[PDB]
Amino acid sequence: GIPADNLQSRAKASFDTRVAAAELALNRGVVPSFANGEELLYRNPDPDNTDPSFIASFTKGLPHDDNGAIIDPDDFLAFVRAINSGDEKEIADLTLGPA
Amino acid sequence: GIPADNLQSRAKASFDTRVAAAELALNRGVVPSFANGEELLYRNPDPDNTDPSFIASFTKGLPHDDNGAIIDPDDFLAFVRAINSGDEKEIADLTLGPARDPETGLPIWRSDLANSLELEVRGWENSSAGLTFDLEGPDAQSIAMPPAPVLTSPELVAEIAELYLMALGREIEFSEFDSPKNAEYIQFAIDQLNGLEWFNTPAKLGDPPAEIRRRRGEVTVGNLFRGILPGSEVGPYLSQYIIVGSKQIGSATVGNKTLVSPNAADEFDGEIAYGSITISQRVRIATPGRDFMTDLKVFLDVQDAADFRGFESYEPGARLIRTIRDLATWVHFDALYEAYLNACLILLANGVPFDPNLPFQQEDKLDNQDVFVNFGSAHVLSLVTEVATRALKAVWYQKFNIHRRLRPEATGGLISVNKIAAQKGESIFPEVDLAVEELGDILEKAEISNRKQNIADGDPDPDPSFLLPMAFAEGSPFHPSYGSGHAVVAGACVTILKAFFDSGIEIDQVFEVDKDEDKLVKSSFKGTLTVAGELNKLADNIAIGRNMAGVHYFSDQFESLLLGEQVAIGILEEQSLTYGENFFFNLPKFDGTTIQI
Amino acid sequence: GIPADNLQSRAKASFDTRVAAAELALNRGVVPSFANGEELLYRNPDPDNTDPSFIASFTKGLPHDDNGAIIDPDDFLAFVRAINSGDEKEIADLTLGPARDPETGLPIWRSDLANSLELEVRGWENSSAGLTFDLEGPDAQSIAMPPAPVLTSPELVAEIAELYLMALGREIEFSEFDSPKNAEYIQFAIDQLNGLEWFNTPAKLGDPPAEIRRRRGEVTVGNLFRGILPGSEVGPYLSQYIIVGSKQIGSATVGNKTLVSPNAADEFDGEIAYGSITISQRVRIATPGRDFMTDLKVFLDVQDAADFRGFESYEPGARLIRTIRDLATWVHFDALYEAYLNACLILLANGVPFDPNLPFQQEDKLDNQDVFVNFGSAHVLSLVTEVATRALKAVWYQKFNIHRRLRPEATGGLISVNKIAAQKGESIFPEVDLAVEELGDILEKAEISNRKQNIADGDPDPDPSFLLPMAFAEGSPFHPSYGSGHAVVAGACVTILKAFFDSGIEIDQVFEVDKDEDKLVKSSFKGTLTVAGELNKLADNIAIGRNMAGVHYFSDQFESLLLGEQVAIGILEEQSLTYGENFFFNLPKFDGTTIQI
Amino acid sequence: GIPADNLQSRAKASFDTRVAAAELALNRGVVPSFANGEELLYRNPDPDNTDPSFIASFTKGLPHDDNGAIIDPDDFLAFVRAINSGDEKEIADLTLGPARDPETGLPIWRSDLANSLELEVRGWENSSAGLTFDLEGPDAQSIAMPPAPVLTSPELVAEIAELYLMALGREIEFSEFDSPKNAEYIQFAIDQLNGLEWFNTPAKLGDPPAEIRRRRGEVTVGNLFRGILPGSEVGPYLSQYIIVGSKQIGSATVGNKTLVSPNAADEFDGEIAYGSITISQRVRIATPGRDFMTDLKVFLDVQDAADFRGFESYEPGARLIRTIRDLATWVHFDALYEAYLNACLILLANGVPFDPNLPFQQEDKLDNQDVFVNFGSAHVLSLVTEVATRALKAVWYQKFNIHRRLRPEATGGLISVNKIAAQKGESIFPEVDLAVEELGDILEKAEISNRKQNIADGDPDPDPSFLLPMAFAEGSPFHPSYGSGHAVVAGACVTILKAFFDSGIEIDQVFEVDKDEDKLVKSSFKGTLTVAGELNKLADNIAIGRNMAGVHYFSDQFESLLLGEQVAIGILEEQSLTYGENFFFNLPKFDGTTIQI
Amino acid sequence: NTPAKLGDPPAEIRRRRGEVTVGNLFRGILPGSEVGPYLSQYIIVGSKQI
Ligand SMILES: [Br-]
Ligand SMILES: [Br-]
Ligand SMILES: [Br-]
Ligand SMILES: [Br-]
Ligand SMILES: [Br-]
Ligand SMILES: [Br-]
Ligand SMILES: [Br-]
Ligand SMILES: [Br-]
Ligand SMILES: [Br-]
Ligand SMILES: [Br-]
Ligand SMILES: [Br-]
Ligand SMILES: [Br-]
Ligand SMILES: [Br-]
Ligand SMILES: [Br-]
Ligand SMILES: [Ca+2]
Ligand SMILES: [Ca+2]
Ligand SMILES: [Ca+2]
Ligand code: NA
Ligand code: NA
Ligand code: NA
Ligand code: NA
Ligand code: NA
């Protein structure tokens, strides 16, 4: 018999087209993103303090000291957790602005 | 063990999200689309000829006889085959334009004008776009528009009457609908329409539900030439979003301080703040009183694909939309979603709140979160524009693959040829006998108007012509009448905006264009308009603008608006699967109900 | 309806999680591994012979001729087949060791020493472990090490020169690299290496990227015999984690009260608190100046599988690592992940914080949660150890199934045989002509050193020998050179520790071993070291320790470190699917970039 | 055609292997876990109060009243909700610690000591680790521990009696259990336990099978304070692997020659050869006779989360485990799998053969293959450590999500409060009336002991206290009693070692700690010990060490050992799919049967 | 004033800039940006009109 394709319904063709596009995107694979290493490199200069300073990270909105360094490293660490979660309550629980 | 979900890779979650949206679309199911039965109904009148005539189908581009009927039924049957196939070679094999000279290859036109301009043919605009799939939203073919009115129906007589009255009223200023100087013509229009069964008699039980929904009642100065979307019939004819400018850069509230733009007055002189630059609402001015396709030979050449695009003249300058013709000019060249993007820019500049059921809309001291890419300006700017092509594919399927309804110019051609023949005691195109019989007074006015045009165009003693005068030299675009690209995009785009903004916000000050000068004036309207009402009115303005140009009928526009609303709703529903936040869009639909998506 | 997820049984969620991790690993794809082309390049010099010689391949255990070339190429070809099959019978059918005595059944060795001990053969160590699958992490065969340096390359000449200089420098104390008494030898080493193209000329555009990454420049006292991981070249040679002890039980802060261990000083005398017991950093002391396999007959016996394991002598007692030889002793017997478990125990005892991007790392008054099984001490103690065998399977695949690179002792054997033959006007092993030509000054020192050793071993007038002296009586383990088990495990384990701890924490006080006594002293280093830097340096210490013993080349170690880092990263990525918490590991990689997993 | 298998890519084979292991785990099915019914049984005694009291549940950290009962039942109900959810915000929203001062935020403690130290709170240790999945082994929730003993049961009376006798015997030396100087106390302990129904009456048909398996009979000096794993009741109390050192580097057989380490005597003085360095078996010495939480206010502060960790004092130096207290100190700080890794290192150093059913265990002249990454030292070193966290997740699910059994200190608190109230003719905590009634003689000794402690701690005339004296200042860890992290890891790790080694090997020389000096002496034991028996005894030593500290009951330990054995067996079974070789592990189980995996 | 060196990250090599001139001052490096006037025609010119 002569090799052939078959028709299907328009609705199934539309579905299959959308899946085929999703499959094309999936089959591209993914690549990691690497940061420049500063976030945990730079440290609070206080000798009795084991915290990063986050001075080279975006911390606009978190409360800063008179030098422009964030006051509480937990504020930035919580901001990072909220970034990765997206949860609205978690976002609303962050510290924004000064006293 | 405690019931649980499992994580998977981000890439698999993205894939599964996309498949889930496709599955959602598939599981809506599909509906058929039914045509009105005219395509094989009307037959060649010659006794020895069996063939359909296709006189009520869009055949612009196929070669026509001296009466406006296609010469060879195979040309239309081949066109329909090409529409359903989409194959480029098959399209290129069609017959387009009139007979060509064998030696030179030139198309030989009927009109001295078309021959003297050495016009070539123009071709169909994406005659198979209705085959194209899309990565989002309802597939073009999954949804339907109902059968178009038939040429013998009260609805069509009413529609074509309305279009002739719009054509003959093109120099009327919106702000002067109720003025003494226009009373004779305005009352004539109102009385003529009120004399027609469609408007003066209600639908009856058992009529098609689509007819019941779109049927209009008593014509008044307040509803003359208006649409029927909720909001369009309240307040001034033109939406605020097509005449007003916006708040300008430099006007702001900063804490407890109010700053005022040095350019603040521009808001009330039709300037939209467009980023840091501006859009002017003032439209180019087509030559008053100049209409087209009023001569039968020129008309037939246009029906035979003569490319008259770009032939209009204009007066210098620009003005806020003033006359019916100006709204026709506006919709001749508007860039797709232009009206709605412009409304969106006004709403954004004016600080109109987004829909409060979206996330993060509270003061930032409460939610710690402002909006931009999702649920803010960038999001609505992309969404309002992206729906347009999805809506177009759906209406293209209705236009070409289902209904193939003739454009109003072609109906006017049948009417003119019929009436001219009847005056010599001959019956041609009896399909439009009812329209000819009922619209005598209007057609007499068109005859006088056309004679003046034909004289102006250089014919000192023209043959009588009852053609529908066109605002555009080329008449309609090169695609069928039902539905409309403009109206489907209007329906989709204003659906997006009503959902995205808090569209129950009331408008503070209502303007109209001044009767005497090219400026805005405070309206005397006493009442409240809302953002949603003015967006619906904007959609009706763009859609009816096409009717005022002579290129669509009322039913094309209304049914297209509903189709676009469906497309936008389906896109919002499928996109709902892509977000992690807890929210929905509140959408007030054209039917007065609300859907939460 | 509102989009949703559904629950399923815990058992199905566990299954689906494991499959999702397998799918993540599969979807990484795989890469090929390319060998350097030597295996079929070098040919038996016999004119009437169409066989490869396999002289640059690991053939330890197969019977060799008096020059160190295998006698029968089929023995190696069968070994390769058995490596790829893994079948136990096929392995047992291989030829291992030399001809045996009919009466006693014992191997007949070349050396009086091996015969007098009646040594038996030792066999290959899991020659098919590279076929083994694993329930977690990248499959052994999915990743690659690049082609090894070839015997004719500037890179190899540089590597083998370095190993001879390390062997001849085994009695130099780390603390005295810059001391006047060592200046003649240290400057000789530096000048000899700076005289070699690899170190004195940069890579050129178009060279393999792996060569560009691992190529070294000017040799200095500050970088002599060091690795190139970031951190290894700053501060003292030895990582703090291989010489310092830890805080001891009884030192603690309880609210505002400080308690001090009665044995607090043990921290500064090399005692790690290991639970409530201790680990001593003091290493057993191999007899100074005694090296092995400096006689050709003993060398060939070892190449023919003679089992000299356990033959070394030691001085009484133990000391903090003092000499180059002591670091070789350290890596002769270390238990797998030992160095890194010990570092982890120091970090835990000293209270170094965990990575702050893990959950629950705040004061408990804020988060109500302390850490142990997840994100605390128990978690890191299992993770640092479990990665080791996954890393070993990957490097075993490279060692046996891909590259089969000869160990440094075998390269030293080719050099010695070549040079001895050349002195009699014969060419043997021209493949190493460049090394012989360029390393004359070093080889002259080795010749003198070997004569002294051979005399000490009881030969009053030994033949000249230019063999690379081995720190271990048996020389290398019974598996190929490229890569290294020690270095791959180092790479995987320090990757875990840098990710799990806050490895940006700075070291407060830096120590070194005293020049005069077996004790720690404060370093004169002026600068800042970090936990990550000192963990990288620890990895480089264990890896280069193998080189200083004579059993690996620089490239084996560096490329193995990179392979181990990939194995640990993959395990962390796959394990990320098993947790419900919102967190990630921040990992500073060997290339200076950070990955968040 | 001949039936056949087909090859597929390596990557697909790896994927399919991992899925097959997940399928194997899934197809084992799951079992439910049943609690003992106490959680909603015991009610608030106040007549006008309906609520459960939760007095028999772990509530350490929640605020307690002056009797040790939680103040607000919602605090425990919320804790249970957070345990089952794992959400970090929900955990951080719990109530932890006592009421805080509104102005300063300080927790206000009951005890002058806690206030003077300015102690803060400590939080629960991974209260939702029982939700975590794992890439290998039985899922945490797939397996079960049986209901814990109830406070009114003969079993619990016996358990708590035993713990008080251990506490009061903390200064007894293991080597002097049968010494005249200890006869009065040892005979008191034996007679007191033999006076209790649990020990003096057998189980009866129809009792739960778990009770039948773990029930103990007549107490003797030979079984006093011992476990019941096979091997634990034969020979000296302490496993050889927690007191002996190992063969040292330099002791070796090389062909026909025996070499002797210059450090050989270190084997018999508690030094394990740890690679080329050493571990000392000598434990830090907690201050003799100093116990904790003997004062009710300090006890309640600890129940209210006061962080006393690190408060102990120590004598200088270290010694081989000598007294009951020393075993408690050993298990206070041991690093996870420490005991078992140390046993593994002894077995490796001593050359104990691997299980002979593994591949390649013959002399290499026969099999041409030595072992390392698979079936050799590196393999067992990773396997013994990796099982620990998988076992912990399983026991954490039992601890927090299922049973939430109160720790022994809390039972001692109920007993003390009850007895004090009964002396004033009031009934408080009648749930422990049986224990109070039966353990009078023991409680009188505790009262005297506690008064001396309370005087030493600075209270010149303390209130009577019958609290269970704790070896640790903070008492138990911040997680429930049933099961035990130490015991589950012991069960998993010794299961691995018994399977991996030839654990029927008999021990040649048996040692104990000398009665007079800190040294080993040859035991007088006449009989044979095996590696398996001494590994089981090691597990029982670590597990009972926790009981001797006051932080677990007998049933917690035994049931945890069984749970760990299941986890290790499941990991071995799933890993069996990853190898190409023909072999199995022979595992002698705790029940005396053998499984071949 | 110094070029990238062999072994530098490829992303650095691609985006590294050389000698500054009036012709490239404050410009980007997309192809086309460094030829002709600073501002694109599309941000200053109008279009053909109706
Ligand atoms: Br369909
Ligand atoms: Br694809
Ligand atoms: Br992914
Ligand atoms: Br669906
Ligand atoms: Br359109
Ligand atoms: Br809807
Ligand atoms: Br289940
Ligand atoms: Br994946
Ligand atoms: Br290794
Ligand atoms: Br990576
Ligand atoms: Br593959
Ligand atoms: Br199965
Ligand atoms: Br534990
Ligand atoms: Br079993
Ligand atoms: Ca907001
Ligand atoms: Ca915490
Ligand atoms: Ca063997
Ligand atoms: Na705007
Ligand atoms: Na609305
Ligand atoms: Na770090
Ligand atoms: Na050992
Ligand atoms: Na056994």
mmCIF file with all atom_site columns, N, CA, C and O in Angstrom, chain D residues 576-593:
data_model
loop_
_atom_site.group_PDB
_atom_site.id
_atom_site.type_symbol
_atom_site.label_atom_id
_atom_site.label_alt_id
_atom_site.label_comp_id
_atom_site.label_asym_id
_atom_site.label_entity_id
_atom_site.label_seq_id
_atom_site.pdbx_PDB_ins_code
_atom_site.Cartn_x
_atom_site.Cartn_y
_atom_site.Cartn_z
_atom_site.occupancy
_atom_site.B_iso_or_equiv
_atom_site.pdbx_formal_charge
_atom_site.auth_seq_id
_atom_site.auth_comp_id
_atom_site.auth_asym_id
_atom_site.auth_atom_id
_atom_site.pdbx_PDB_model_num
ATOM 1  N N  . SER D 1 576 ? 20.862 -3.119  44.715 1.00 0.00 ? 576 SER D N  1
ATOM 2  C CA . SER D 1 576 ? 21.241 -4.377  44.069 1.00 0.00 ? 576 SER D CA 1
ATOM 3  C C  . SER D 1 576 ? 21.017 -4.294  42.558 1.00 0.00 ? 576 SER D C  1
ATOM 4  O O  . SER D 1 576 ? 21.709 -4.969  41.797 1.00 0.00 ? 576 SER D O  1
ATOM 5  N N  . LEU D 1 577 ? 20.080 -3.434  42.115 1.00 0.00 ? 577 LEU D N  1
ATOM 6  C CA . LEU D 1 577 ? 19.798 -3.324  40.689 1.00 0.00 ? 577 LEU D CA 1
ATOM 7  C C  . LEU D 1 577 ? 20.900 -2.582  39.932 1.00 0.00 ? 577 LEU D C  1
ATOM 8  O O  . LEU D 1 577 ? 20.841 -2.532  38.694 1.00 0.00 ? 577 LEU D O  1
ATOM 9  N N  . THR D 1 578 ? 21.880 -1.972  40.618 1.00 0.00 ? 578 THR D N  1
ATOM 10 C CA . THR D 1 578 ? 22.826 -1.086  39.922 1.00 0.00 ? 578 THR D CA 1
ATOM 11 C C  . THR D 1 578 ? 24.104 -1.805  39.465 1.00 0.00 ? 578 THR D C  1
ATOM 12 O O  . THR D 1 578 ? 24.901 -1.213  38.733 1.00 0.00 ? 578 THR D O  1
ATOM 13 N N  . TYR D 1 579 ? 24.297 -3.071  39.886 1.00 0.00 ? 579 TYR D N  1
ATOM 14 C CA . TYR D 1 579 ? 25.573 -3.759  39.656 1.00 0.00 ? 579 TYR D CA 1
ATOM 15 C C  . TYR D 1 579 ? 25.420 -4.798  38.554 1.00 0.00 ? 579 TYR D C  1
ATOM 16 O O  . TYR D 1 579 ? 24.371 -5.434  38.465 1.00 0.00 ? 579 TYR D O  1
ATOM 17 N N  . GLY D 1 580 ? 26.513 -5.041  37.805 1.00 0.00 ? 580 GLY D N  1
ATOM 18 C CA . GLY D 1 580 ? 26.489 -6.136  36.827 1.00 0.00 ? 580 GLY D CA 1
ATOM 19 C C  . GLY D 1 580 ? 26.977 -7.466  37.401 1.00 0.00 ? 580 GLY D C  1
ATOM 20 O O  . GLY D 1 580 ? 26.727 -8.517  36.820 1.00 0.00 ? 580 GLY D O  1
ATOM 21 N N  . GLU D 1 581 ? 27.674 -7.434  38.533 1.00 0.00 ? 581 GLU D N  1
ATOM 22 C CA . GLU D 1 581 ? 28.316 -8.640  39.055 1.00 0.00 ? 581 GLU D CA 1
ATOM 23 C C  . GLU D 1 581 ? 27.290 -9.576  39.688 1.00 0.00 ? 581 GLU D C  1
ATOM 24 O O  . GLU D 1 581 ? 26.188 -9.165  40.094 1.00 0.00 ? 581 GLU D O  1
ATOM 25 N N  . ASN D 1 582 ? 27.706 -10.849 39.814 1.00 0.00 ? 582 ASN D N  1
ATOM 26 C CA . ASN D 1 582 ? 26.905 -11.890 40.424 1.00 0.00 ? 582 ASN D CA 1
ATOM 27 C C  . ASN D 1 582 ? 27.310 -12.009 41.895 1.00 0.00 ? 582 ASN D C  1
ATOM 28 O O  . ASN D 1 582 ? 28.382 -12.554 42.189 1.00 0.00 ? 582 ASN D O  1
ATOM 29 N N  . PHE D 1 583 ? 26.476 -11.495 42.827 1.00 0.00 ? 583 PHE D N  1
ATOM 30 C CA . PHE D 1 583 ? 26.854 -11.584 44.230 1.00 0.00 ? 583 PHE D CA 1
ATOM 31 C C  . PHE D 1 583 ? 25.635 -11.273 45.096 1.00 0.00 ? 583 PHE D C  1
ATOM 32 O O  . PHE D 1 583 ? 24.572 -10.873 44.588 1.00 0.00 ? 583 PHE D O  1
ATOM 33 N N  . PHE D 1 584 ? 25.810 -11.396 46.420 1.00 0.00 ? 584 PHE D N  1
ATOM 34 C CA . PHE D 1 584 ? 24.797 -10.894 47.327 1.00 0.00 ? 584 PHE D CA 1
ATOM 35 C C  . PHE D 1 584 ? 25.452 -10.583 48.666 1.00 0.00 ? 584 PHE D C  1
ATOM 36 O O  . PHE D 1 584 ? 26.571 -11.027 48.937 1.00 0.00 ? 584 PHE D O  1
ATOM 37 N N  . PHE D 1 585 ? 24.736 -9.810  49.488 1.00 0.00 ? 585 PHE D N  1
ATOM 38 C CA . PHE D 1 585 ? 25.144 -9.587  50.867 1.00 0.00 ? 585 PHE D CA 1
ATOM 39 C C  . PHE D 1 585 ? 24.425 -10.612 51.742 1.00 0.00 ? 585 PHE D C  1
ATOM 40 O O  . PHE D 1 585 ? 23.221 -10.768 51.652 1.00 0.00 ? 585 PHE D O  1
ATOM 41 N N  . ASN D 1 586 ? 25.181 -11.295 52.603 1.00 0.00 ? 586 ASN D N  1
ATOM 42 C CA . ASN D 1 586 ? 24.579 -12.121 53.628 1.00 0.00 ? 586 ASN D CA 1
ATOM 43 C C  . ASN D 1 586 ? 24.436 -11.244 54.875 1.00 0.00 ? 586 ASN D C  1
ATOM 44 O O  . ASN D 1 586 ? 25.437 -10.738 55.400 1.00 0.00 ? 586 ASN D O  1
ATOM 45 N N  . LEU D 1 587 ? 23.196 -11.067 55.347 1.00 0.00 ? 587 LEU D N  1
ATOM 46 C CA . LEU D 1 587 ? 22.941 -10.191 56.490 1.00 0.00 ? 587 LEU D CA 1
ATOM 47 C C  . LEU D 1 587 ? 22.313 -11.000 57.626 1.00 0.00 ? 587 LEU D C  1
ATOM 48 O O  . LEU D 1 587 ? 21.150 -11.428 57.525 1.00 0.00 ? 587 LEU D O  1
ATOM 49 N N  . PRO D 1 588 ? 23.022 -11.170 58.765 1.00 0.00 ? 588 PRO D N  1
ATOM 50 C CA . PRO D 1 588 ? 22.395 -11.719 59.969 1.00 0.00 ? 588 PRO D CA 1
ATOM 51 C C  . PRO D 1 588 ? 21.591 -10.603 60.633 1.00 0.00 ? 588 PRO D C  1
ATOM 52 O O  . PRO D 1 588 ? 22.146 -9.617  61.121 1.00 0.00 ? 588 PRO D O  1
ATOM 53 N N  . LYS D 1 589 ? 20.262 -10.780 60.669 1.00 0.00 ? 589 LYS D N  1
ATOM 54 C CA . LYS D 1 589 ? 19.370 -9.757  61.200 1.00 0.00 ? 589 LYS D CA 1
ATOM 55 C C  . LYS D 1 589 ? 19.303 -9.800  62.719 1.00 0.00 ? 589 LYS D C  1
ATOM 56 O O  . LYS D 1 589 ? 19.760 -10.771 63.359 1.00 0.00 ? 589 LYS D O  1
ATOM 57 N N  . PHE D 1 590 ? 18.693 -8.753  63.300 1.00 0.00 ? 590 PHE D N  1
ATOM 58 C CA . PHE D 1 590 ? 18.538 -8.693  64.752 1.00 0.00 ? 590 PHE D CA 1
ATOM 59 C C  . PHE D 1 590 ? 17.678 -9.845  65.287 1.00 0.00 ? 590 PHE D C  1
ATOM 60 O O  . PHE D 1 590 ? 17.826 -10.220 66.451 1.00 0.00 ? 590 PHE D O  1
ATOM 61 N N  . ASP D 1 591 ? 16.806 -10.422 64.440 1.00 0.00 ? 591 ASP D N  1
ATOM 62 C CA . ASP D 1 591 ? 15.936 -11.490 64.893 1.00 0.00 ? 591 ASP D CA 1
ATOM 63 C C  . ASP D 1 591 ? 16.596 -12.868 64.815 1.00 0.00 ? 591 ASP D C  1
ATOM 64 O O  . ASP D 1 591 ? 15.956 -13.872 65.130 1.00 0.00 ? 591 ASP D O  1
ATOM 65 N N  . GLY D 1 592 ? 17.847 -12.936 64.391 1.00 0.00 ? 592 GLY D N  1
ATOM 66 C CA . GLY D 1 592 ? 18.569 -14.206 64.406 1.00 0.00 ? 592 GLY D CA 1
ATOM 67 C C  . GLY D 1 592 ? 18.436 -14.974 63.082 1.00 0.00 ? 592 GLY D C  1
ATOM 68 O O  . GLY D 1 592 ? 19.090 -16.003 62.900 1.00 0.00 ? 592 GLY D O  1
ATOM 69 N N  . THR D 1 593 ? 17.629 -14.444 62.153 1.00 0.00 ? 593 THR D N  1
ATOM 70 C CA . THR D 1 593 ? 17.538 -15.044 60.814 1.00 0.00 ? 593 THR D CA 1
ATOM 71 C C  . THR D 1 593 ? 18.488 -14.289 59.882 1.00 0.00 ? 593 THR D C  1
ATOM 72 O O  . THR D 1 593 ? 18.962 -13.197 60.225 1.00 0.00 ? 593 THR D O  1
#
